[PDB]
Write a protein that binds this ligand. Structure first.
Ligand code: GN5
Ligand code: ZN
Length: 208
């Protein structure tokens, strides 16, 4: 039941999603090992993901969380990178999209930094890079990220350098405690707490 609607580059909605993508690029401590070496992207396409059933699943859960947290869903727009983006947009987030080995336990991980999500497009640690050239820094191959609506509710704050959320909480917030330039990362433990709103197709750009 999923349809994808192309946004025009002239549309303010395209432009605001592109700006969030581009402006949340940062340098990574691996020197580009996982995600490649780049300062910006070539955005090729932004599509709106429309699925009524998946949307209703999201809003149902959002209301449950809101009602447990003084009518505050604590909703964010966050990036998600995965080899399984095409499964996610069709069937929704579920336990198969969780990172069993992540720093904050087995949940589904989201990032404020688009470049953090870019590290996971080809798998954990960038896997073996693009399927065509086996290059984690491929400048040719088309990559895809999701820009998602995420319900955090009451989030457990972890300071730092599928399971259940901590008792009394709906998510975990991974606050950076060393790298002063990194933005937060977030983990949810219920697939119904995220909706994949935008599918972004892009390339990383080789620095000049
Ligand atoms: C390949 C699997 C399912 C194991 C996977 C997929 C995505 C991610 C995940 N993607 C993110 O965008 C992300 C954002 C912030 C921190 N960690 C992330 N990993 C982890 C693991
Ligand atoms: Zn490639």
């Amino acid at each position: 039941g999923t349809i994808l609607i192309d946004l025009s580059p002239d549309d303010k909605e395209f432009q605001s999603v592109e700006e969030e993508m581009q402006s949340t690029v940062r340098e990574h401590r691996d020197g580009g090992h996982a995600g490649g070496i780049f300062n910006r992207y070539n955005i090729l396409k932004i599509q709106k993901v429309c699925n009524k059933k998946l949307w209703e699943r999201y809003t149902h859960r959002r209301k449950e969380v809101s009602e447990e947290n003084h009518n505050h869903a604590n909703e964010r727009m966050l990036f998600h990178g995965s080899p399984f983006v095409n499964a996610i947009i069709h069937k929704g987030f579920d336990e198969r999209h969780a990172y069993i080995g992540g720093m904050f336990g087995a949940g589904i991980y989201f990032a404020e930094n688009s470049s953090k999500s870019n590290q996971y497009v080809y798998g954990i640690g960038g896997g073996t890079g693009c399927p065509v050239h086996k290059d984690r820094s491929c400048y040719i191959c088309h990559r895809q990220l999701l820009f998602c609506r995420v319900t955090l509710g009451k989030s457990f704050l972890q300071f730092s350098a599928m399971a259940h959320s901590p008792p009394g909480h709906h998510s975990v917030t991974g606050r950076p405690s060393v790298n002063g330039l990194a933005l937060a990362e977030y983990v949810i433990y219920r697939g119904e707490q995220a909706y994949p709103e935008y599918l972004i197709t892009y390339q990383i750009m080789r620095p000049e």
